[PDB]
């Protein structure tokens, strides 16, 4: 039916009519197929951002500095978004990207725990440095997203080095569609400590039939943009390589 010359050109003008450069990396099995109006993006590093709160979940739950019930409160302070201006479980903190939460959390676990942590699963270039709490978002921790769609078909499966109770509760935090049977299990990062910026949407389709597909989008964002483009292109790319 559809050339691949033709999804190609799709995808590629999802991410040109968004005014923005970038990739989606789509994983099929063991087969890795690079998309968009930018490919080189595809081993180049960028700050996870927000998309660490997966592994900073990982790591908090693992060694229990949290639970999943546990209410992170409000300190009462002025936050950048009102919507985290309230108490909240690590999953609600997740769907709405609450760096506060996950600050606490990193916080919790410590710097030396977070480094071998980091270490042991091999995350990224794997170097978090001497501050616990922004390592994620202004350097010195980077990641490609060749590497990102690693992560997430790892975590789909149940590869990584946690107990499997530790990684289904964090999958349970990423559900964040349902499409006529798929289920969307993503986590989507905005780096705006950096620049140029960078937007984020990593994790997998859970289809009917019980396949993961992992993706990794990774794109330019600049001030103006809306946050919604990284989910618009993301559901559009899945959509025309009927995944979903
Ligand atoms: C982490 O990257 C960063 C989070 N990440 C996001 C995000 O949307 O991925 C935000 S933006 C904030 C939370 N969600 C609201 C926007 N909704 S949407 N659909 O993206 O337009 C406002 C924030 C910058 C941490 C480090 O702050």
Same mark, same amino acid.
Do not use: C
């Given at each position: 039916?559809?050339?691949?010359?033709?999804?190609?050109?799709?995808?590629?003008? &999802? #991410?040109?009519?968004?005014?923005?450069?970038?990739?989606?990396?789509?994983?099929? =099995?063991?087969? +890795?197929?690079?998309?968009?109006?930018?490919?080189?993006?595809?081993?180049?590093? &960028?700050? $996870?951002?927000?998309?660490?709160?997966?592994?900073?979940?990982? *790591?908090?739950?693992?060694?229990?500095?949290?639970?999943?019930?546990?209410?992170?409160?409000?300190?009462?302070?002025?936050?950048?978004?009102?919507?985290?201006?309230?108490?909240?479980?690590?999953? @609600?903190?997740?769907?709405?990207?609450?760096?506060?939460?996950?600050?606490?959390?990193?916080?919790?676990?410590?710097?030396?725990?977070?480094?071998?942590?980091?270490?042991?699963?091999?995350? =990224?270039?794997?170097?978090?440095?001497?501050?616990?709490?922004?390592?994620?978002?202004? =350097?010195? +921790?980077?990641?490609? $997203?060749?590497?990102?769609?690693? #992560?997430?078909?790892?975590?789909?499966?149940?590869?990584?080095? #946690? /107990?499997?109770?530790?990684?289904? @509760?964090?999958?349970? %935090?990423?559900?964040?569609? @349902?499409?006529?049977?798929?289920?969307? &299990?993503?986590?989507?990062?905005?780096? %705006?400590?950096?620049? $140029?910026?960078?937007?984020?949407?990593? =994790?997998?389709?859970?289809?009917?039939?019980?396949?993961?597909? $992992? #993706?990794?989008?990774? +794109?330019? %964002?600049?001030?103006?943009?809306?946050?919604? *483009?990284?989910?618009?292109?993301?559901? /559009?790319?899945?959509?025309?390589?009927?995944?979903?």
């Amino acid at each position: 039916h559809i050339s691949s010359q033709q999804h190609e050109k799709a995808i590629k003008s &999802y #991410f040109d009519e968004a005014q923005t450069q970038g990739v989606i990396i789509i994983k099929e =099995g063991k087969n +890795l197929s690079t998309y968009g109006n930018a490919l080189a993006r595809a081993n180049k590093e &960028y700050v $996870p951002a927000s998309t660490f709160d997966m592994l900073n979940a990982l *790591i908090g739950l693992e060694n229990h500095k949290a639970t999943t019930n546990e209410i992170f409160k409000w300190d009462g302070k002025k936050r950048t978004y009102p919507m985290w201006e309230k108490d909240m479980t690590l999953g @609600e903190a997740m769907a709405l990207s609450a760096v506060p939460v996950y600050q606490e959390l990193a916080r919790r676990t410590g710097l030396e725990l977070m480094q071998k942590e980091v270490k042991r699963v091999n995350f =990224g270039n794997t170097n978090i440095g001497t501050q616990v709490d922004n390592f994620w978002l202004v =350097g010195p +921790l980077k990641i490609t $997203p060749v590497q990102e769609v690693n #992560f997430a078909d790892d975590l789909a499966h149940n590869r990584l080095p #946690f /107990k499997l109770e530790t990684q289904e @509760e964090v999958k349970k %935090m990423l559900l964040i569609k @349902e499409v006529n049977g798929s289920k969307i &299990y993503a986590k989507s990062g905005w780096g %705006m400590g950096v620049t $140029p910026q960078v937007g984020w949407l990593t =994790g997998w389709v859970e289809q009917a039939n019980g396949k993961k597909i $992992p #993706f990794s989008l990774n +794109l330019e %964002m600049k001030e103006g943009m809306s946050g919604s *483009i990284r989910n618009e292109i993301t559901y /559009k790319s899945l959509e025309n390589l009927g995944i979903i």
